Design a protein that fits this description.
The structure is a homodimer. Chain A has about 325 residues and is of the alpha+beta class. Chain A has 8 helices and 14 strands. Chains A and B meet through helix 6 and helix 7 of A and helix 7 and helix 8 of B. The structure holds ligand FM0 (2 copies). Chain B: GO terms for molecular function: ATP binding; diphosphomevalonate decarboxylase activity.
């Protein structure tokens, strides 16, 4: 029997991945830039047994659903081909995330599975190839191989499409993210990629957004990073508005949280917001101002709905 | 002695959006717009000028308006007094036959009816152009209400040059209709567009496409090409709402139900009922459809929406009118 266990942390995209150039290999229409979070993660143990008939995934103690079981089986097929065996695996996975709060486990789940498999089957994959393996499960997972800032290079094929870690001289140690708890990303983004009247607008600005953001981290320039990523995040959501037919991930409460962020800026508490495939609002903020910003939120939201996390420096990690 | 006049003006809905002012004081817009004038919804406004009157008075649907609206209306009438070269104050009696509680706007038809009423009362002999200009000062969209069918508001660059005109459609307005999906709300158009215009990160994007949209739209009506019209106006409308998303801080007029309404429109398209939607400063979804499909399209909506929430109107051919 072959087993291994690993922990991967979720990451939030500051420059968004939204829309695939290639649905089967998960190659993106554009590069993305993300930060990896300390607080939320997945621990996954994988066990390969000559005895097993089909792949098993137990998550937080409970067997998973149809589509997920199928989603896992097709993914392990990839792992089997790569490793060169025919072993089925029993996967035991736990998400360390506030429950029923809508946090995406996608990135942390596949990065963790990829790394656990790597360990179990002794593949000694390089980070590049680990990121590649993770990508095949979920595009965002490619980034969770790394800590701090990470960039997913879109490439043009399976070999060239992967993430890498960005050294920012420890800037990530100065930063945090506040979550305000309030249609599938894969399904949402394919509709928008395929049909949206505003998608071209998204493509025309994404590289510049990205360049500006990467420059800002080179200078550890928070306001400048913050401004571009906020703009970029909003433009992603604009594209869904142009889909055929239109849709939104946002609700009034998301807008209320956004308004609170602008006010914090006016009161000289720099922070910037972004949203993914749901109404949750994430507030990038400097650690020094994290408590102050949270207080401003507490005036309006339940304390239980205001959850802060640091940015973790290290990457995916083997659990011995 | 006593000078009175009474007018009926119909509301209009924009297919190409006015959204954002170049001049807040005189209400000169950042771009041209194109609308259609609704047969079913209108305002009737009577104005009576009397030397004895010492202050303008406004009665709306039989009721006091309040010192706020009262003050606002007197400011507007000053414009009329300056225009007429008199100092006569007016008693204004107005009835809105517009589902305002249901969220439809009354300001376009209200200000158009008032402009026309004063012109009739005072015998100003204003051209439709000057009527449009007078209406515009009260509310931009009111400039278009002077006219029936398809109308366009030319933005101009000053108070003399910004006004609307009626577009001759070869009677195409008679083939069209508009379904209103009243959606459970619940930020003014003037204040909203101002925040967006001043502030929105996506406003330039709106500006870079509006003229092309408008030219395509007008070319579409020249040809009575309903699909060509519907497609561009629907994209225009959506782009207008995108800009709000970019404002500092962002906001939307749209709620989940609005999105549900758009979805049904798209199903209607796939199912051979051509129609297209647009939304204004509220979650209500308006559905441009050909008169011959009005009923079929309403029934698709009637599968999910309360019957009282689905209201259709034809498009009127004629413009603002003087009545008894
Ligand atoms: O994370 C980002 O860059 C942006 C988003 O989070 C915004 F919602 C999308 C994530 O995409 P994902 O869940 O990875 O899709 P998959 O490849 O189809 O599994
Ligand atoms: O009708 C349109 O062109 C589009 C809108 O309806 C979309 F909400 C805006 C109307 O603006 P309006 O109320 O006329 O503004 P005012 O000049 O500040 O009174």
């Amino acid at each position: 029997v072959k087993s291994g266990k690993a922990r991967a942390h979720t990451n939030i995209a500051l420059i968004k991945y939204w829309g695939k150039a290639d649905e089967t290999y998960i190659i993106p229409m554009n590069n993305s830039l993300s930060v990896t979070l300390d607080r939320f993660y997945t621990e996954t143990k994988v066990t390969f047994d000559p005895d097993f008939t089909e792949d098993c995934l137990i998550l937080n103690g409970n067997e998973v659903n149809a589509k997920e079981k199928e989603k896992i089986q097709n993914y392990m097929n990839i792992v089997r081909d790569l490793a060169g065996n025919r072993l089925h695996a029993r996967i035991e996975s736990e998400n360390y995330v506030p429950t029923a709060a809508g946090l995406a486990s996608s990135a942390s789940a596949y990065a963790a599975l990829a790394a656990a498999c790597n360990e179990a089957l002794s593949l000694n994959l390089s980070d590049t190839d680990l990121s590649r393996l993770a990508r095949r499960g979920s595009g965002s997972a490619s980034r969770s191989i790394f800590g701090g800032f990470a960039e997913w290079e879109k490439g043009h094929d399976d070999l060239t499409s992967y993430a890498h870690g960005i050294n920012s001289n420890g800037w990530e140690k100065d930063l945090s993210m506040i979550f305000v708890v309030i249609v599938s990303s894969r399904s949402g983004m394919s509709l928008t990629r395929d049909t949206s009247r505003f998608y071209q607008y998204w493509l025309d600005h994404v590289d510049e957004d990205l360049n500006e953001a990467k420059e800002a981290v080179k200078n550890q320039d928070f306001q400048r990073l913050g401004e571009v990523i906020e703009a970029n995040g909003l433009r992603m959501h604009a594209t869904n508005l142009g889909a055929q037919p239109p849709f939104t991930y946002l609700v009034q409460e998301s807008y209320d949280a956004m308004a609170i962020v602008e006010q914090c800026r006016k009161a000289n508490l720099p922070c910037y917001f972004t949203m993914d495939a749901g109404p949750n609002v994430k507030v990038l903020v400097e650690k020094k101002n994290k408590q102050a910003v949270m207080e401003q939120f507490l005036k309006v939201f339940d304390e239980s709905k205001i959850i802060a996390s640091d940015i973790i420096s290290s990457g995916v990690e083997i659990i011995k």
